[PDB]
PDB file of C-alpha atoms and ligand atoms in Angstrom:
ATOM      1  CA  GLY A 925       0.000   0.000   0.000  1.00 17.39           C
ATOM      2  CA  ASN A 926       0.898   3.698   0.149  1.00 13.66           C
ATOM      3  CA  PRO A 927       3.591   4.487   2.633  1.00 12.76           C
ATOM      4  CA  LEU A 928       2.642   5.821   6.054  1.00 13.34           C
ATOM      5  CA  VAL A 929       5.421   8.009   7.462  1.00 15.11           C
ATOM      6  CA  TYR A 930       5.926  10.267  10.501  1.00 15.36           C
ATOM      7  CA  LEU A 931       7.593  13.459  11.630  1.00 14.28           C
ATOM      8  CA  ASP A 932       8.164  14.048  15.374  1.00 14.89           C
ATOM      9  CA  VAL A 933       8.425  17.850  15.749  1.00 16.55           C
ATOM     10  CA  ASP A 934       9.725  20.039  18.619  1.00 16.46           C
ATOM     11  CA  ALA A 935       9.780  23.781  19.321  1.00 18.77           C
ATOM     12  CA  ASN A 936      12.994  24.929  21.012  1.00 17.34           C
ATOM     13  CA  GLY A 937      13.497  21.392  22.136  1.00 16.79           C
ATOM     14  CA  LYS A 938      10.081  20.825  23.552  1.00 19.43           C
ATOM     15  CA  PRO A 939       7.964  18.059  21.758  1.00 18.56           C
ATOM     16  CA  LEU A 940       4.855  19.137  19.924  1.00 16.53           C
ATOM     17  CA  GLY A 941       3.883  15.639  18.886  1.00 14.60           C
ATOM     18  CA  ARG A 942       3.730  13.507  15.754  1.00 15.78           C
ATOM     19  CA  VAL A 943       2.514  14.244  12.241  1.00 16.12           C
ATOM     20  CA  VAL A 944       1.516  11.095  10.300  1.00 17.02           C
ATOM     21  CA  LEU A 945       1.427  11.350   6.564  1.00 14.90           C
ATOM     22  CA  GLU A 946       0.144   9.135   3.755  1.00 19.29           C
ATOM     23  CA  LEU A 947       2.304   9.264   0.622  1.00 21.18           C
ATOM     24  CA  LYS A 948       0.312   8.721  -2.617  1.00 21.41           C
ATOM     25  CA  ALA A 949       2.736   6.281  -4.290  1.00 25.59           C
ATOM     26  CA  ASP A 950      -0.192   5.033  -6.265  1.00 23.46           C
ATOM     27  CA  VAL A 951      -0.436   8.416  -8.083  1.00 21.69           C
ATOM     28  CA  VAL A 952       3.143   9.918  -7.795  1.00 20.90           C
ATOM     29  CA  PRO A 953       5.480   7.084  -7.128  1.00 23.60           C
ATOM     30  CA  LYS A 954       8.724   8.889  -7.722  1.00 22.74           C
ATOM     31  CA  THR A 955       7.734  11.909  -5.529  1.00 25.83           C
ATOM     32  CA  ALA A 956       6.375   9.650  -2.801  1.00 21.88           C
ATOM     33  CA  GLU A 957       9.507   7.533  -2.817  1.00 19.50           C
ATOM     34  CA  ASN A 958      11.745  10.596  -2.479  1.00 20.28           C
ATOM     35  CA  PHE A 959       9.889  11.769   0.610  1.00 19.55           C
ATOM     36  CA  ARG A 960       9.646   8.244   2.119  1.00 15.85           C
ATOM     37  CA  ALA A 961      13.423   7.745   1.828  1.00 11.53           C
ATOM     38  CA  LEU A 962      14.194  11.220   3.212  1.00 12.19           C
ATOM     39  CA  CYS A 963      12.073  10.317   6.304  1.00 17.53           C
ATOM     40  CA  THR A 964      13.861   7.013   6.905  1.00 21.38           C
ATOM     41  CA  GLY A 965      17.307   8.454   6.203  1.00 22.98           C
ATOM     42  CA  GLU A 966      18.183   5.215   4.343  1.00 21.43           C
ATOM     43  CA  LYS A 967      20.246   7.015   1.629  1.00 23.21           C
ATOM     44  CA  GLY A 968      22.493   8.634   4.315  1.00 23.88           C
ATOM     45  CA  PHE A 969      20.715  11.978   4.383  1.00 18.71           C
ATOM     46  CA  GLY A 970      17.235  13.313   5.043  1.00 21.87           C
ATOM     47  CA  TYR A 971      14.906  15.247   7.243  1.00 20.36           C
ATOM     48  CA  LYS A 972      15.969  14.183  10.763  1.00 18.48           C
ATOM     49  CA  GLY A 973      17.434  17.227  12.610  1.00 16.03           C
ATOM     50  CA  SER A 974      16.205  19.782  10.036  1.00 15.22           C
ATOM     51  CA  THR A 975      13.683  22.607  10.515  1.00 14.68           C
ATOM     52  CA  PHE A 976      10.404  24.148   9.505  1.00 14.88           C
ATOM     53  CA  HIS A 977      12.040  27.327   8.112  1.00 16.10           C
ATOM     54  CA  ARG A 978       8.930  29.071   6.697  1.00 15.05           C
ATOM     55  CA  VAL A 979       5.658  29.037   8.503  1.00 16.72           C
ATOM     56  CA  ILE A 980       2.852  31.393   7.421  1.00 14.91           C
ATOM     57  CA  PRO A 981      -0.338  31.284   9.476  1.00 13.46           C
ATOM     58  CA  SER A 982      -3.448  30.689   7.412  1.00 16.73           C
ATOM     59  CA  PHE A 983      -1.400  29.331   4.571  1.00 16.99           C
ATOM     60  CA  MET A 984       1.225  26.569   5.112  1.00 13.30           C
ATOM     61  CA  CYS A 985       4.129  25.188   7.044  1.00 15.23           C
ATOM     62  CA  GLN A 986       7.297  24.658   4.935  1.00 15.45           C
ATOM     63  CA  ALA A 987      10.293  22.430   5.678  1.00 16.22           C
ATOM     64  CA  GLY A 988      12.884  20.112   4.185  1.00 18.51           C
ATOM     65  CA  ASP A 989      15.901  22.361   3.503  1.00 19.20           C
ATOM     66  CA  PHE A 990      18.300  20.100   5.322  1.00 17.20           C
ATOM     67  CA  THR A 991      21.376  21.614   3.558  1.00 16.20           C
ATOM     68  CA  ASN A 992      21.038  25.366   4.171  1.00 13.03           C
ATOM     69  CA  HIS A 993      18.252  25.516   6.716  1.00 10.40           C
ATOM     70  CA  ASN A 994      16.784  28.579   5.064  1.00  8.25           C
ATOM     71  CA  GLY A 995      14.727  27.803   1.975  1.00  9.95           C
ATOM     72  CA  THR A 996      17.535  27.944  -0.525  1.00 11.87           C
ATOM     73  CA  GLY A 997      18.596  24.343  -0.499  1.00 13.89           C
ATOM     74  CA  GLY A 998      17.810  20.628  -0.117  1.00 13.60           C
ATOM     75  CA  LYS A 999      18.317  17.743  -2.532  1.00 11.82           C
ATOM     76  CA  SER A1000      16.443  14.673  -3.582  1.00 10.94           C
ATOM     77  CA  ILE A1001      17.400  11.038  -3.398  1.00  9.22           C
ATOM     78  CA  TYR A1002      17.820  11.188  -7.212  1.00 10.55           C
ATOM     79  CA  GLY A1003      20.136  14.188  -7.460  1.00 14.94           C
ATOM     80  CA  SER A1004      19.761  17.837  -6.803  1.00 16.94           C
ATOM     81  CA  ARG A1005      16.397  18.274  -8.546  1.00 17.20           C
ATOM     82  CA  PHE A1006      13.844  16.120 -10.235  1.00 17.55           C
ATOM     83  CA  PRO A1007      10.998  16.725 -12.616  1.00 19.07           C
ATOM     84  CA  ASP A1008       7.381  17.500 -11.837  1.00 19.10           C
ATOM     85  CA  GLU A1009       5.845  14.052 -11.835  1.00 18.40           C
ATOM     86  CA  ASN A1010       2.251  15.034 -12.542  1.00 21.80           C
ATOM     87  CA  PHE A1011      -0.338  17.442 -11.207  1.00 24.34           C
ATOM     88  CA  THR A1012      -3.132  14.903 -10.736  1.00 24.12           C
ATOM     89  CA  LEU A1013      -3.644  15.575  -7.022  1.00 25.24           C
ATOM     90  CA  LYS A1014      -4.914  19.015  -6.065  1.00 26.51           C
ATOM     91  CA  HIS A1015      -4.535  21.403  -3.152  1.00 26.05           C
ATOM     92  CA  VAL A1016      -8.004  20.646  -1.793  1.00 22.82           C
ATOM     93  CA  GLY A1017      -7.748  21.837   1.810  1.00 26.80           C
ATOM     94  CA  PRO A1018      -5.797  21.789   4.975  1.00 23.88           C
ATOM     95  CA  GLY A1019      -3.399  18.850   5.538  1.00 22.72           C
ATOM     96  CA  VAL A1020      -2.365  18.539   1.885  1.00 22.48           C
ATOM     97  CA  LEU A1021       1.320  17.585   1.525  1.00 25.65           C
ATOM     98  CA  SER A1022       2.959  19.192  -1.536  1.00 25.23           C
ATOM     99  CA  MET A1023       6.418  19.892  -2.966  1.00 25.65           C
ATOM    100  CA  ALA A1024       7.987  23.337  -2.692  1.00 25.04           C
ATOM    101  CA  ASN A1025       9.844  24.489  -5.777  1.00 25.87           C
ATOM    102  CA  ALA A1026      11.759  27.291  -7.528  1.00 27.51           C
ATOM    103  CA  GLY A1027       9.838  26.891 -10.778  1.00 28.76           C
ATOM    104  CA  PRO A1028       9.015  24.028 -13.141  1.00 27.74           C
ATOM    105  CA  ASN A1029      10.991  20.845 -12.667  1.00 27.42           C
ATOM    106  CA  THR A1030      12.859  21.946  -9.524  1.00 25.76           C
ATOM    107  CA  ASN A1031      11.666  19.484  -6.889  1.00 26.93           C
ATOM    108  CA  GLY A1032      14.235  18.639  -4.304  1.00 21.52           C
ATOM    109  CA  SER A1033      13.497  17.938  -0.640  1.00 23.63           C
ATOM    110  CA  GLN A1034      11.555  20.997   0.408  1.00 26.31           C
ATOM    111  CA  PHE A1035       7.897  20.455   1.093  1.00 29.00           C
ATOM    112  CA  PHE A1036       4.865  22.017   2.703  1.00 26.31           C
ATOM    113  CA  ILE A1037       1.791  21.026   4.717  1.00 26.97           C
ATOM    114  CA  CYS A1038      -1.180  23.227   3.948  1.00 27.28           C
ATOM    115  CA  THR A1039      -3.260  24.805   6.743  1.00 29.55           C
ATOM    116  CA  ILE A1040      -5.864  26.115   4.292  1.00 28.20           C
ATOM    117  CA  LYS A1041      -7.005  25.205   0.790  1.00 31.67           C
ATOM    118  CA  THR A1042      -4.185  26.432  -1.531  1.00 31.29           C
ATOM    119  CA  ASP A1043      -5.880  25.860  -4.918  1.00 30.26           C
ATOM    120  CA  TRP A1044      -3.917  28.662  -6.583  1.00 33.21           C
ATOM    121  CA  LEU A1045      -0.956  26.214  -6.475  1.00 32.54           C
ATOM    122  CA  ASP A1046      -2.713  23.585  -8.552  1.00 33.11           C
ATOM    123  CA  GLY A1047      -0.666  22.614 -11.625  1.00 33.79           C
ATOM    124  CA  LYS A1048       2.373  24.410 -10.147  1.00 30.89           C
ATOM    125  CA  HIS A1049       3.239  22.284  -7.105  1.00 32.18           C
ATOM    126  CA  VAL A1050       3.153  18.485  -7.053  1.00 29.11           C
ATOM    127  CA  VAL A1051       0.817  17.263  -4.342  1.00 28.64           C
ATOM    128  CA  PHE A1052       1.870  13.841  -3.046  1.00 30.01           C
ATOM    129  CA  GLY A1053       0.182  13.076   0.244  1.00 31.75           C
ATOM    130  CA  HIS A1054      -1.835  14.246   3.193  1.00 31.09           C
ATOM    131  CA  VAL A1055      -2.033  14.280   6.953  1.00 31.63           C
ATOM    132  CA  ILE A1056      -3.552  11.130   8.464  1.00 30.41           C
ATOM    133  CA  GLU A1057      -3.005  12.125  12.107  1.00 30.58           C
ATOM    134  CA  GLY A1058      -1.619  15.146  13.946  1.00 28.49           C
ATOM    135  CA  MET A1059      -3.300  18.074  12.223  1.00 30.93           C
ATOM    136  CA  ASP A1060      -3.327  19.464  15.783  1.00 32.85           C
ATOM    137  CA  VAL A1061       0.440  19.218  15.747  1.00 30.99           C
ATOM    138  CA  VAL A1062       0.507  21.057  12.407  1.00 30.99           C
ATOM    139  CA  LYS A1063      -1.663  23.749  13.983  1.00 32.58           C
ATOM    140  CA  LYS A1064       0.870  24.077  16.816  1.00 37.33           C
ATOM    141  CA  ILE A1065       3.714  24.525  14.323  1.00 37.34           C
ATOM    142  CA  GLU A1066       1.516  27.132  12.494  1.00 39.07           C
ATOM    143  CA  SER A1067       1.108  28.994  15.813  1.00 37.07           C
ATOM    144  CA  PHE A1068       4.848  29.697  15.907  1.00 39.98           C
ATOM    145  CA  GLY A1069       4.962  31.228  12.396  1.00 36.76           C
ATOM    146  CA  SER A1070       4.281  34.725  11.235  1.00 36.75           C
ATOM    147  CA  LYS A1071       3.116  36.570   8.210  1.00 38.23           C
ATOM    148  CA  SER A1072       6.779  37.008   7.171  1.00 38.34           C
ATOM    149  CA  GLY A1073       7.235  33.217   7.453  1.00 38.48           C
ATOM    150  CA  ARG A1074       9.773  33.612  10.245  1.00 38.52           C
ATOM    151  CA  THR A1075       9.225  31.418  13.229  1.00 44.19           C
ATOM    152  CA  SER A1076       9.330  32.675  16.785  1.00 47.47           C
ATOM    153  CA  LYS A1077      10.804  29.388  18.080  1.00 47.05           C
ATOM    154  CA  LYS A1078      13.164  26.949  16.367  1.00 45.83           C
ATOM    155  CA  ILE A1079      10.869  24.188  14.913  1.00 47.03           C
ATOM    156  CA  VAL A1080      12.835  20.917  14.403  1.00 47.26           C
ATOM    157  CA  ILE A1081      11.957  17.540  12.983  1.00 46.92           C
ATOM    158  CA  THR A1082      13.600  15.600  15.810  1.00 47.82           C
ATOM    159  CA  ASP A1083      12.799  12.228  14.353  1.00 49.57           C
ATOM    160  CA  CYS A1084      11.136  10.793  11.321  1.00 45.05           C
ATOM    161  CA  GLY A1085      10.502   7.450   9.650  1.00 44.36           C
ATOM    162  CA  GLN A1086       8.153   4.970   8.108  1.00 40.63           C
ATOM    163  CA  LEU A1087       5.305   3.133   9.944  1.00 45.06           C
ATOM    164  CA  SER A1088       4.106   0.912   7.076  1.00 47.72           C
TER     165      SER A1088
HETATM  166  C1  LIG B1283       4.055  27.112  -0.596  1.00 45.35           C
HETATM  167  C2  LIG B1283       5.230  26.589  -1.373  1.00 45.35           C
HETATM  168  O1  LIG B1283       6.081  27.733  -1.642  1.00 45.35           O
HETATM  169  C3  LIG B1283       7.236  27.608  -2.393  1.00 45.35           C
HETATM  170  O2  LIG B1283       7.550  26.551  -2.896  1.00 45.35           O
HETATM  171  C4  LIG B1283       7.918  28.940  -2.629  1.00 45.35           C
HETATM  172  N1  LIG B1283       9.212  28.669  -3.165  1.00 45.35           N
HETATM  173  C5  LIG B1283      10.252  28.406  -2.408  1.00 45.35           C
HETATM  174  O3  LIG B1283      10.185  28.447  -1.188  1.00 45.35           O
HETATM  175  N2  LIG B1283      11.333  28.106  -3.098  1.00 45.35           N
HETATM  176  C6  LIG B1283      12.601  27.836  -2.528  1.00 45.35           C
HETATM  177  C7  LIG B1283      13.097  26.511  -2.953  1.00 45.35           C
HETATM  178  C8  LIG B1283      12.248  25.404  -3.118  1.00 45.35           C
HETATM  179  C9  LIG B1283      12.749  24.163  -3.498  1.00 45.35           C
HETATM  180  N3  LIG B1283      14.037  23.976  -3.698  1.00 45.35           N
HETATM  181  C10 LIG B1283      14.907  25.062  -3.557  1.00 45.35           C
HETATM  182  N4  LIG B1283      16.333  24.824  -3.766  1.00 45.35           N
HETATM  183  C11 LIG B1283      14.443  26.313  -3.157  1.00 45.35           C
HETATM  184  K1  LIG B1284      -0.910  36.085   1.498  1.00 45.83           K
HETATM  185  K1  LIG B1285      13.584   7.081  12.847  1.00 45.25           K
END
């Protein structure tokens, strides 16, 4: 079946809880696989110890720049960037999991979890999953963002992995 993965998130070292995500390998296998492997760390790099660097209330929480920690970097399991797989899945509401990018065919490791419907991103960002459990944890992360996207506390994926 589709992978089930998790992110354990803290704020200045205090645990907020666990976000559980379904990855839609049945629709975007290559994008799902990238994220799955970056959660387990099996390629020798990934999300563990990296941050939510851009958190905008009423929009989204963005993470996955485990190279520069600031929204400039990241890399995929394939290489630095990989193509847009398809745009079949849409930004239908809160809890959508989607790839951040710097334009067409620039997927790396950065991603976002939506806290509203972000339909203006449809056909521009590859959606590849959604939140199964821990939307309340996402809402806690969101609480530490700002309209600038800067966070008021350091928000860290302390652990991550695959459940099934
Ligand atoms: C809501 C999603 O917003 C975005 O994706 C806005 N764009 C960005 O943050 N781009 C930065 C970016 C993304 C992916 N790989 C990089 N090397 C750099
Ligand atoms: K806005
Ligand atoms: K782990």
